[PDB]
Amino acid sequence: RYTLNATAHLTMPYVMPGDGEVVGVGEPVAIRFDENIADRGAAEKAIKITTNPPVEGAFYWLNNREVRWRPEHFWKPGTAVDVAVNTYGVDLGEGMFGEDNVQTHFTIGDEVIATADDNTKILTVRVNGEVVKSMPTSMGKDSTPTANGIYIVGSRYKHIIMDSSTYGVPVNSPNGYRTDVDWATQISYSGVFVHSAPWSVGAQGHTNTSHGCLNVSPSNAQWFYDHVKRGDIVEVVNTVGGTLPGIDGLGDWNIPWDQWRAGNAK
Numbered sequence: 603r604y605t606l607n608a609t610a611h612l613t614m615p616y617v618m619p620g621d622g623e624v625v626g627v628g629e630p631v632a633i634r635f636d637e638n639i640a641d642r643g644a645a646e647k648a649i650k651i652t653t654n655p656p657v658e659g660a661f662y663w664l665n666n667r668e669v670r671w672r673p674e675h676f677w678k679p680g681t682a683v684d685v686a687v688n689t690y691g692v693d694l695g696e697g698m699f700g701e702d703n704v705q706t707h708f709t710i711g712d713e714v715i716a717t718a719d720d721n722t723k724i725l726t727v728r729v730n731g732e733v734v735k736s737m738p739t740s741m742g743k744d745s746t747p748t749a750n751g752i753y754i755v756g757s758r759y760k761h762i763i764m765d766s767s768t769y770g771v772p773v774n775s776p777n778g779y780r781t782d783v784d785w786a787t788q789i790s791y792s793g794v795f796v797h798s799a800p801w802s803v804g805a806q807g808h809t810n811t812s813h814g815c816l817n818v819s820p821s822n823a824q825w826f827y828d829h830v831k832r833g834d835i836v837e838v839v840n841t842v843g844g845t846l847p848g849i850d851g852l853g854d855w856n857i858p859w860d861q862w863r864a865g866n867a868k
Contacts, residue, residue, distance in 0.1 A: 603703075604690065604702070604703060605703045605704070605705050606702055606703065606704055606705070607621045607704070607705050607706065608620055608621055608685075608704050608705065608706040609621060610622075610623050611698075612637075612698070612699050612700070612701035613635045613636055613637035613639070613689075613694060613698055613699070613700060613701055614635070614636045614701045614702060615633050615634070615635055615687045615689055615700065615701075615702075615704050616633070616634045616635075616636075616704070617631070617632065617633050617634075617685055617687055617704050617705075617706045618631070618632040618634070618706075619631070619632075619706065619708040619832065619833070620706060620708070621705070621706050621707055621708070622707065622708065623708045623709075623832070624708070624709050624710075624711045624831065625708055625709070625710060625711065625831060625832050625833035626710075626711060626712075626713075626714050626754075626755060626830075626831050626832060626833030626834030626835065627676035627677045627678075627679065627710060627711075627712075627713045627714070627715075627833060627834070627835065628672075628676055628677070628752070628754045628755075628833050628834065628835045628854070628855060629677070629708075629710070629754065629832060629833025630670045630671060630672040630754070630854045631651060631659075631670065631671040631672065631683060631685055632668065632669075632670055632671075633645075633649060633668070633669045633670075633671075633685075633687060634667060634668045634669075635667040635668070635694075636667070637667060637694075637698055638666040638667050639666060639667060639669075639694050639695065639698070640694060640695025640696040640698065641693065641694050641695030641696075642663060642669070642866070642867045642868060643867040643868070644692060644693055644694055644695065645669060645689070645692075645694055646661045646669065646865075646867060648687065648688045648689045648692045648700065649661070649669070649671075649685070649686070649687050649688070649689075650685075650686035650688060651671055651683065651684070651685050651686070652683070652684045652686075653681055653682070653683050653684075654681065654682050655678065655680075655681060657673045657677075657678070657681065658673065658674065659671050659672055659673045659674075660672075660859075660862060660863045660865060661865055661867070662854075662857060662862045662865055662866060663865075663866050663867075664849045664851065665849070670854055672854060672855075672862075674859040674862075674863075676713065676835070676855075677710040677833075678710065679710050679711065679712055679713055679730070680709075680710060681709065681710040682707065682708070682709050682710075683707070683708050683709070683710070684705075684706070684707050685704075685705065685706045685707075685708075686703075686705060687703060687704040687705070688703050689701075689702070689703060689704070690702050690703045710833075711831060711833075712729055712730055713728075713729070713730050713731065714727070714728070714729055714829075714830060714831070714834035714835065715727075715728045715834070715835040715836075715837060716728070716796075716826075716830075716834070716835065716836045716837070717836075717837045717838075717839060718739055718741065718748075718816055718836060718837070718838045718839065719839050719840055720741065720748075720810075720838075720839065720840040720841040720842075721839075721840050723738060723739055723740065723741075723806070723807050723808060723809075723810075724736055724737065724738055724739065724807065725737045725738075725739040725796070725816060725818065725836075727826070727829075735822070735825060735829075737806075737818045737819065737822040737825075737826075738806040738807030738808075738818070738819070739806055739807070739816050739817060739818050740799065740802045740805045740806040740807070740808075740809060740810055740811050740812055740816075740817040740818075741810045741812055741814070741815075741816055741817070741838075741841060742810055742812050742813060742814040742815075742841065742843060743809075743810045743811055743812065743813075744810065744842055745777075746777050746812075746813050746814060747810070747814070747841050747842050747843035748794065748810075748812070748814050748815075748816070748838055748841050748843050749790075749792075749794075749814075749838065749841070749843040749844050749845055749846040750838050750839060750840070750841050750843055750844065750845050750846070751837070751838060751845045751846035751853065751855075751856045752835060752836075752837050752846070752853075752855040752856055753789040753790050753794065753835070753836045753837070753838065753846060753852050753853070754789070754832075754833060754834075754835065754852040754853075754854060754855070755787060755788070755789055755830055755831065755832055755833060755834040755835070755836065755852075756788040756789060756790075756791070756832060756851070756852050757788050757832070758786070758787050758788070758827055758830070759785075759786040759787075759788075760784065760785065760827075761782065761783070761784050761786075762782075762783060762786055763780060763781060763782050763783070764779065764780075764781050764783060764786070764793065764795065764815075765779070765780045765781075766778045766779045766780070766793075766813070767780075768793065769792065769793050777813060779813060783795070783797045783798055783799070784797070784798040784820065784823065784824070785797060785798045785820070785823035785824045785826065785827040786798070786823075786827075787823075787826050787827055787830055788852075789816075789836050789852060790846055790850050790851065790852050790853065791850050791851030791852055791853075792814075792846070792847075792850055792851075793814065793815075794814050794815055794816070794846075795815045795816070796815065796816040796818060796823065796826050796836065797815055797816070797817070797818070797823050798818070798819075798820045798823035798824065799812070799815075799817035799818065799819075799823070800819075800820050801817075802817040803819050805817070806818060806819060810841075816836070816838075835855075
């Protein structure tokens, strides 16, 4: 027990969520190393997770330095999770060892699930199974459509600039953009946000005009930004698009329990 808490040569682990955070029902526990991990099974073995009420869960790797852990279903509101990353000096393979141990405790807030349905072009926000907000929306147009699936709410911004080059699409090109936006809530690592779009209010509710983001009105975007937290859920249904890769970053729930469970330790 020479521990360090997770605030929100060798390899350091970094665990999300951070100590004390309150997170939405889809927040997976995340352990991310600063080095690639030859011996996944080892790293998994060194990570103890307790939950109360107890719930079964399992590890799946998003890449070679990041493991994730989650239940089969969304968390039940109330659950406390404690994470013990007992990795100090542990054999992680090919001459790499855990630099230290790491701890975190977190808790699960309300069930918040927002469904965007391309049939109606409404994004309906549900807190504990009840409709508290209904927002006309406008998504990827057919030629750059919004992927179907379940997205985990990641970070939030009062203002930023989305630049398509970040995703290997030049600004000068036909799907290019470098756009200033307010009240931006990120929901995929591939660049999908729910955000203020005063330029598509006319279209919100009628027609997809965006590059992929869920355009909503300025006050609904602000509302989304005020009431939403990491781990809350946006589900997108019925678009002409594909499915959001399970290994996106915020795609976890699109892998099915069974593929997930089986893990990918090797």
